[PDB]
Structure formats: structure tokens, C-alpha cells
Design a protein around this nucleic acid. Structure first.
Ligand SMILES: [Mg+2]
Ligand SMILES: [Mg+2]
Ligand SMILES: [Mg+2]
Ligand SMILES: [Mg+2]
Ligand SMILES: [Mg+2]
Ligand SMILES: [Mg+2]
Ligand SMILES: [Mg+2]
Ligand SMILES: [Mg+2]
Ligand SMILES: [Mg+2]
Ligand SMILES: [Mg+2]
Ligand SMILES: [Mg+2]
Ligand SMILES: [Mg+2]
Ligand SMILES: [Mg+2]
Ligand SMILES: [Mg+2]
Ligand SMILES: [Mg+2]
Ligand SMILES: [Mg+2]
Length: 109
RNA sequence: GCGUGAGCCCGGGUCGAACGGCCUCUAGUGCAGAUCUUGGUGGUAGUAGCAAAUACUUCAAUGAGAACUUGAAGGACCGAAG
């Protein structure tokens, strides 16, 4: 019985998703993979990436995407009256030096 | 419906201002071709294709509608015979 408004932290293993893709498409493909990951995790289909997360993805150039990335995905209410979906997932990067050895963890203020 | 035939006449529809039969006279008088002339239109066919010049991404604004509008941020190229 997970409440709509919920936030978790995940480790996305981007290495196995970007394995073998064209160098000029590595970072955009990682962006799309992050969006798809949030879609699968929160069942929301409306995913918004933090510009800090975009900076973290593009930090090492177009083909230097990190093997793992620690993110926080927060499913929250879309209050816009014209919204086709009632919920959206906003995903940002977690301030950690390395993402190794971390489990999926629920986060609450 | 008539004529072997070229054709002729009528019914119905559309349409809107002229036209026909008979005897003579006259000719720029009869088309499937000429890689014919001009114009229009097909199959091919939603097909060939839209692949040189390294490359785009996130958020926001605008807007009926945004990859190729703009702002910010990031990532890149031209690399002083630019
Ligand atoms: Mg390969
Ligand atoms: Mg009149
Ligand atoms: Mg003639
Ligand atoms: Mg002809
Ligand atoms: Mg002939
Ligand atoms: Mg012609
Ligand atoms: Mg043609
Ligand atoms: Mg094609
Ligand atoms: Mg070509
Ligand atoms: Mg193409
Ligand atoms: Mg090109
Ligand atoms: Mg608007
Ligand atoms: Mg472009
Ligand atoms: Mg060069
Ligand atoms: Mg250079
Ligand atoms: Mg000089």
C-alpha cells in the first residue's frame, strides 16, 4: 500500500544499459534510460530530471557516463489543472562520492 | 427506335440563349498513330530518397502546437592560412 507521494533513493547501474552503444549517443541514451528507469519504478510516465542530475550525467563528456549513479526519485502530485496525469516523478542526484554498496532506501523528511 | 454502315431521331438528367430541316453555293470540312503540337493526368509510388562538414542534453518561459524559438546550465566544434 505505497502512498502516491513517496520518495526513494536508487542506484542506477548505467554500465549495463550503456554497454556497447555509440559514443556520440552515450549521454543522451543515459538520460533516456534514467527516464525509463523512473517510469518503471514509479509507474508515472511523467519524469522530470533535475539540472544537477543532468550535470552529473554529462560531467565526463558525451561518452564518460558513470557506471553507477545514485538518484532520489520523488513521486509527487501534479496539481496543474491541465495535467493528463495526476502524478509525476522528479528525480535528482544524491550527494555521494561513490554509489557503491547502497540499497534502495525510502526517504522521508 | 431507325439505318448494312458512316450516322439520324427520341426518353430522362444538367443547363441557360440561341438553333435546325430541305434545294442550291462555299471551304482553313471528318484523326489512333507522324520519337506529331499545346495542355492536362496516371501506374511507377507514399516508392528512390531527405546519410560529407565530430553533437547534443536538462530546466523554464512563450505558444493551439517546440529537436531545429528564447533565457539559464552543461557538453562540444571552429582553434588565429578561423
Ligand atoms: Mg557493439
Ligand atoms: Mg444569359
Ligand atoms: Mg484541315
Ligand atoms: Mg488525338
Ligand atoms: Mg491511320
Ligand atoms: Mg506532352
Ligand atoms: Mg510523370
Ligand atoms: Mg524509404
Ligand atoms: Mg545518399
Ligand atoms: Mg537520417
Ligand atoms: Mg554530419
Ligand atoms: Mg503554456
Ligand atoms: Mg540540432
Ligand atoms: Mg578538427
Ligand atoms: Mg578543438
Ligand atoms: Mg597571414
Amino acid at each position: 500500500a505505497i502512498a502516491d507521494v513517496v520518495a526513494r533513493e536508487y542506484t542506477i547501474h548505467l554500465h549495463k544499459r550503456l554497454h556497447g552503444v555509440t559514443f556520440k549517443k552515450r549521454a543522451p541514451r543515459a538520460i533516456k534510460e534514467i527516464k525509463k528507469f523512473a517510469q518503471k519504478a514509479m509507474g508515472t510516465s511523467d519524469v522530470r530530471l533535475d539540472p544537477q542530475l543532468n550535470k552529473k550525467v554529462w560531467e565526463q563528456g558525451i561518452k564518460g557516463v558513470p557506471f553507477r549513479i545514485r538518484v532520489r526519485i520523488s513521486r509527487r502530485r501534479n496539481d496543474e489543472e491541465g495535467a493528463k496525469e495526476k502524478l509525476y516523478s522528479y528525480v535528482q542526484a544524491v550527494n555521494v562520492k561513490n554509489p557503491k554498496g547502497l540499497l534502495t532506501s525510502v526517504v522521508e523528511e
